[PDB]
Amino acid sequence: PPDVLRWVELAKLYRSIGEYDVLRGIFTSEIGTKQITQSALLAEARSDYSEAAKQYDEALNKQDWVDGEPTEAEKDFWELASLDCYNHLAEWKSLEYCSTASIDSENPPDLNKIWSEPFYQETYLPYMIRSKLKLLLQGEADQSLLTFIDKAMHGELQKAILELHYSQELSLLYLLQDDVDRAKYYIQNGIQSFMQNYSSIDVLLHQSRLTKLQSVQALTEIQEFISFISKQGNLSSQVPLKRLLNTWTNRYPDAKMDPMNIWDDIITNRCFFLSKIEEKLTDISSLIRSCKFSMKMKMIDSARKQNNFSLAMKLLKELHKESKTRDDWLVSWVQSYCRLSHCRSRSQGCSEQVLTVLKTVSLLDENNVSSYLSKNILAFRDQNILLGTTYRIIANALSSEPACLAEIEEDKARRILELDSEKVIAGLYQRAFQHLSEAVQAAAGVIDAYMTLADFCDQQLRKEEEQAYPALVVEKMLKALKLNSNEARLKFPRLLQIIERYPEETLSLMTKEISSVPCWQFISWISHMVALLDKDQAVAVQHSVEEITDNYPQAIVYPFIISSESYSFKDTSTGHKNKEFVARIKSKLDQGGVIQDFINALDQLSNPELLFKDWSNDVRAELAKTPVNKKNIEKMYERMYAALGDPKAPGLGAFRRKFIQTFGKEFDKHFGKGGSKLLRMKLSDFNDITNMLLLKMNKDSKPPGNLKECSPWMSDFKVEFLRNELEIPGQYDGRGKPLPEYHVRIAGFDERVTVMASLRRPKRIIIRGHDEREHPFLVKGGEDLRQDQRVEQLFQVMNGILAQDSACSQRALQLRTYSVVPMTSRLGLIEWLENTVTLKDLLLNTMSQEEKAAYLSDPRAPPCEYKDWLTKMSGKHDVGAYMLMYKGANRTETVTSFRKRESKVPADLLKRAFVRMSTSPEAFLALRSHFASSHALICISHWILGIGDRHLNNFMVAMETGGVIGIDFGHAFGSATQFLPVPELMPFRLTRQFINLMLPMKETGLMYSIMVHALRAFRSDPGLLTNTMDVFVKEPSFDWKNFEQKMLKKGGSWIQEINVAEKNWYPRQKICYAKRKLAGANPAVITCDELLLGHEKAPAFRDYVAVARGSKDHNIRAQEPESGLSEETQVKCLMDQATDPNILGRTWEGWEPWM
């Protein structure tokens, strides 16, 4: 057929530019029609190339398999993919046969049969000659290849190909017989071909150029050895060998970023070179043997770190005779082995989990224990660490499955009980603690030793939440945090919660350990120590806060206004010195009086008409809950009057704001009424006059400033002398010792204000710097911007996680964070990245003048159609029809209506949007591949902490690289799907256009291996993300109060009728749920549990649990169990949940689920 070989040639094109995701995106959609195809591609996605090749010979050789026949396009693809999956690991002997055995049978003539039918030439010859040269380079006679080379090296057909393409294999071939003149000619033609090829590629096709550029080390190592032995003063001595070995032994490629066949090229070339120089200059070889072993051990340790396991295991087997001259080479051997089994166990089930670590117990009664690990103490420390970790791993898996392992494998159970049935679990915990308590008794090789005790005792105490360990946590964590850590630096609120919940245990010794500290690491945890001053037990952290306020007094200022806007002290004798200490710090900071002038400057440019409504909704709900609260209106009216009122009030307050001439002048007539009654109302009877006064101030002709004259302090800043310079906000973020003399000091503003078209209308200011990089910014007054600061701290630890799992780093996965700063409470600055467009306006201005016209203005538009659908399926013309549409509609009517309403917008919208500005078909690839990879990463990372409300304008593309920005974080942990009237059940947003950027590829090509590599990068870790989620939700800013207030800032759907919302917050629940869907959980269980905890006793709860629950006919989220899953199954149920017209027919009318 025509349209199957076109898929074979799209595979042949997309295979050559790296691009292995959309390669496997067609080997399941079109060249499929089996089960072994999916069951080997789904196990070749991860680096499991010893099972996905094992079930290829059981798809070729089969005999019967009758339900059709493996069709004419895949019986060859199985052989080719078997060749790739044989090459990616070291299969040398089993490659030559399966590469030769399809041109002729019974020992084929591999001499001229390839040169006829050139279908044998492109796809069989490269792996053939590569396998043959590699198996030449390990030591035999083998006598097969030189003869084909000499025979074929005559002609123009059989010689104008083999030297145009290869040249480097040929170069090694000729140096196998030491004729080093034409071989040097061949390597010179190799370098010339590389330069012309690298010139021929386009510039922005990344990973093609990387795959080219990863080879010049191989070429130059060939060239350096050729001109090393052929030059004279090298075989007469040993010191050129010594300098050449020292410059060799540094220049490995990196781990974690360059795949394993380049390591195999360079190490095989190098060891063959070393045997050649030991042959020519014939101690001379013990140095060479040791350097060869160390290079192979580096090869092994980098082979472990990308989940390339069997390629490490066979190398351990090739090395096992080698490391037996002395004890230390075995202790490196067994170190690598135990590390290999330890990382090997971390993705399996449970019964195999004990078995895959139980084998590494017997070989630790082995040698190198007596008189080696008693004078060499550092590997002894590592030995204690891995042993304690071993028994920890056994008892950690053995206690989830409670007793279901001591019923089988009788010798294994007797070997376990060698070292009843329930005291053995705590006995093996204790048997780990013997070695881990020897660990601290026996740089940068001890930070791990301290931190492993730290998290063993931490998980042990969170097991005891259902013994003198809390004195082992604090000293042994802080004596490593005194060193530079980036793991203990992220584990400070663990100390600051073990100390509160374990108060009498080691409280002054905590002060004795935190005393001698470098006081420049806590500058990220400053907002969790300046809220510790007000409560009891602030005496452990007073000297450290004094040290910050004396050394670096600017990096604590804006974390003091927020913590002294609300503080109420104790009244006992120990609770009296704290107000003295706080007043001392308050009067030893802000001495210049210019920082509060700055905050008042950035306060006095807001919009006042949208500022009075905050007082309106702050006093209309204070007096109407219980009229027993005293001195609360007379004590809040100064915060309204000292800003707004008579224009003598700011004339005493800050300075002449030019809008007050039209506002504070204007409201004396309708503030005489306030002085007569509203200064003394206390009554709650008549709010219509305040609402019509809001209407009276509404619809002004010019609210904005139209210059910087909305705050004349700032138009003429003009620094004069040593008067406490301002030091522009948003720096000092952990990470070494900050040098304040090089930070940017703000030195001028610009005379243009621009208003943003958000709901609250913020403003954009163009503030300069003392280095002239005129930084723009955004002002946000009247919203508590600590929550966005928290989620950007989350994203910083999150995409620190995403740069260590190597399959994520080789595609370079990274979130895009942007800096937000809360100056005081309800006033803060937002960064503003230049040159970015919102998603909804990109899709809008891409459309023609008439498609946008019939999308905006017609009843056949999908908005008005959804409106009529809702008012006819329920009956009423308003909101609240969602309560009855769930119970008046069925699974086969909603889907048909959803297709009829989504077939109105043109599906050629993101594609035409990129066509309009791409201007080259070599730029369309890299302007669509980066959109798809970035959108996949943000939709998997907006789910582990489930950030609901991903509607249109909360995404921002960047017109230089087409990448999406995620902004506007309101509902951090799973809380949008509870408290709203009609919830949001979908885990992210994949509507129509985000799929029609991928036709004809079905949505398993590029948006799937990104998601699986991200989710496997998250859940294999000790729980840093779990602990930072744990300590975010136990920091008091959000005990439903500021929550409901920011719910009502944007005036909308949520109003009242709560009654459990003051009672079912429960931060024991949200960390339980994130621990569940990070430790394996069905994504229909979690939406049902979250929907039960906030929508019990609703009228339509059955429809809610139905649409979340599944159907078992069509939808794959129902046919799976509820626990213990795998990553591809999680993301398959997740992808079904995101687009399923059972769900997206029933969601919010402004959330835009169609477009």
- Can you spell out the DSSP letters for 78-142? HHHHHHHHHHTTT--HHHHHHHHTTT-SSS--TTTTTTSSTHHHHTTHHHHHHHHHHHHTTS---
729's tokens: 């906000």
Classify residue 1132 as exposed, middle or buried by CB count within 10 Å of its CB (0-12, 13-18, 19+). Answer: buried
Neighbouring residues of 1074: CB distance < 8 A, sequence distance ≥ 6: 944, 945, 973, 1026, 1029
Which residue matches tokens 């900050």? 738
Whole-number Å distance between alpha carbons of 620 and 605:
26
Query: What are the residues whose beta carbons fall under 8 Å from the beta carbon of 141, sequence distance 6 or more?
Result: none
The rounded distance, in Å, linking the Cα atoms of 7 and 28 is 11
Q: How many angstroms separate the CA atoms of 1136 and 28, rounded? A: 17
Cis, peptide link before residue 118, omega less than 30° from 0: no
Cα–Cα nearest to 495, from 445, 444, 461: 461
Nearest-CA neighbor of 959 among 856, 834, 1046? 834
How far apart are the C-alpha atoms of 989 and 976, rounded to whole Å? 14
Query: Dihedral sign, CA of 1097, 1099, 1102, 1107?
Result: negative
Residue the block writes with tokens 């209309």: 620
CA distance 807 to 1089: 33
Calculate ∠ Cα 584-601-593, nearest 5°: 30
Distance of CA 424 to the CA centre of its chain: 39
Query: 316: burial class by Cβ within 10 Å (0-12, 13-18, 19+)?
Result: middle
Compute the distance between CA of residue 642 and CA of residue 648 in angstroms, rounded to an integer.
10
The per-residue DSSP string of 17-72 comes to TS-HHHHHTTTTTTS--SSHHHHHHTTTSSS-TTTTTHHHHHHHS-----SS---T
**Cα torsion 1144, 1148, 1151, 1152: sign:** positive
Query: Tokens 């290849």 sit at which residue?
Result: 145
Q: How far apart are CA 928 and CA 886, in angstroms?
A: 38
Please state, as a whole number, how many other Cβ atoms lie within 10 Å of the Cβ of residue 828: 25
- Residue 290: CA atoms inside 13 Å, Cβ hemisphere, count? 12
Q: What is the dihedral of CA 1122, 1128, 1133, 1135, to 10 degrees?
A: 160
Distances (CA, A) of 617 to 1045, 1109, 1111: 9, 39, 44
- The CA distance from 608 to 618, in Å, is 15
Q: How far apart are CA 465 and CA 1035, in angstroms?
A: 20
Decide: residue 566, CB within 10 A, 0-12 exposed, 13-18 middle, 19+ buried: exposed
Q: Which residues contact 753 (CB under 8 A, 6 or more apart)?
A: 605, 704, 705, 706, 707, 708, 710, 763, 764, 765
Q: Residue 51 corresponds to which amino acid?
A: E
State the Cα–Cα distance between residues 116 and 101, nearest whole angstrom: 16
- Written as one string, the DSSP assignment of 773-814 is ----EEEEESS-TTHHHHHHHHHHHHHHHTTTSHHHHTTT--
Contacts of 141-147 with CB under 8 Å at 24 or more apart are: 144/110, 145/173, 146/173, 147/111
Residue 610 structure tokens: 């949208």
Alpha carbon separation from 554 to 158, 588, 741 (Å, rounded):
75, 12, 12
Angle at CA of residue 1063, ends 981 and 1148, nearest 5°: 15
Q: Using DSSP, state whether 821 is helix, strand or coil.
A: strand
For residues 324 and 330, the answer to whether their CB atoms sit within 8 Å is yes
Say if CB 784 and CB 822 are below 8 A apart: yes
**CA dist 81 → 27, 1014, 1127 (Å):** 10, 25, 24
What one-character-per-residue DSSP string does 1069-1088 give? THHHHHHHTTSSB-TTHHHH
Which residues sit opposite 829 in a β-bridge? 779, 821
Both tokens of residue 600? 């008042």
582, 542 contact by CB (below 8 A):
no
Q: At what angle do helices 447-461 and 423-439 cross, to 10 degrees?
A: 150
SS3 226: helix
- Check: CB of residue 770 under 8 Å from CB of residue 717: no
How far apart CA 389 and CA 433 sit, in angstroms, is 10
For residues 225 and 1072, give the distance between their C-alpha atoms in angstroms, rounded to a whole number. 60
- Decide if 664 contacts 649 (C-beta within 8 A): yes
Instruction: Round to whole Å and give the CA distance between 32 and 73.
Output: 9
Cα-based angle 772, 775, 778 (whole degrees, multiple of 5): 160
Please return the burial class of 704, using the count of CB atoms within 10 Å of its CB with bins 0-12, 13-18 and 19+.
middle
Cα 910 to its chain centre, rounded Å, is 26
| Cα–Cα dist 715/749, whole Å | 6
Give residues with Cβ within 8 angstroms of 913, minimum separation 6.
842, 843, 846
Torsion of CA 566, 571, 573, 578, to 10 degrees: 10
Q: What contacts 163, CB < 8 A, 6 or more positions away?
A: 170, 186, 189
- Is 86 in contact with 98 (CB distance < 8 Å)? yes
d(CA 915, CA 903): 22
Distance CA 1086, CA 1106 (A): 13
> CA dist 982 to 635, 939, 985, 1100, 1147, Å?
38, 22, 10, 11, 7
- The position carrying tokens 């029809």 is 881
- Cα gap 487→976, rounded to integer Å: 32
List, in sequence order, every residue forming a beta bridge with 958; answer none if it has no partner. Answer: 963
Q: Decide if 1109 contacts 1092 (C-beta within 8 A).
A: no
Across the beta sheet with 955-958, what order do the strands follow?
837-838, 955-958, 963-966
Q: How far apart are CA 1146 and CA 1154, in angstroms?
A: 11
DSSP letters, 505-557, are SSSHHHHHHHSS--TTSTTSSSTTTSSTTTSS--TTSSHHHHHHHHHSTTTTS
The H or E element that residue 829 is part of is strand 827-830
What's the rounded Cα separation, in Å, for the pair 462 and 439? 22
Torsion of CA 806, 807, 811, 817, to 10 degrees: -70
d(CA 940, CA 946): 10
| Residue 838, beta-bridge partner list | 956
Distance CA 287, CA 771 (A): 54
What are the distances in angstroms from CA 478 to CA 445, 473, 483, 486, 1024?
A: 16, 9, 9, 13, 17
Residues 6+ apart with CB under 8 A from 384: 435, 436, 438, 439, 442
Containing 828, the helix (H) or strand (E) segment is strand 827-830
> What are residue 777's phi and psi, to 5 degrees?
-160, 175
- Separation CA 567–CA 476 (nearest Å): 33
**At a CB cut-off of 8 Å and minimum separation 6, what does 272 contact?**
137, 172
- How far apart are alpha carbons 319 and 314 in whole angstroms? 8
Name the token pair of 993.
Answer: 């256009």
For 360, what's the count of Cα atoms within 13 Å in the CB-facing half-sphere? 26
Q: Is 626 exposed, middle or buried (0-12, 13-18, 19+ CB in 10 A)?
A: exposed
Which amino acid appears at position 551 of this protein? Answer: N
As a whole number of angstroms, the distance between CA 664 and CA 754 comes to 23
Closest CA to 1035 of 844, 790, 845: 790
> What is the CA 858 to chain-centroid distance, rounded?
42
DSSP label at 1021?
Answer: S
Rounded to 5 degrees, what angle do the CA atoms 578, 580, 582 make? 70
Nearest one of 1063, 1073, 1068, 1075 to 1039, comparing CA atoms: 1063
How far is the CA of 879 from the CAs of 335, 423, 979, 981, 1149, in angstroms?
65, 59, 16, 9, 10
Neighbours of 576 (CB within 10 A): 11
- For residue 106, what are its two tokens? 């019974």
Residue carrying the six token digits 């990096």: 555
Nearest one of 489, 421, 413 to 450, comparing CA atoms: 489
Rounded to whole angstroms, the Cα distance separating 893 from 869 reads: 11
Which ranges of 137-181 does DSSP label H, i.e. alpha helix?
145-152, 162-165, 168-175
1088 residue type, one letter: C
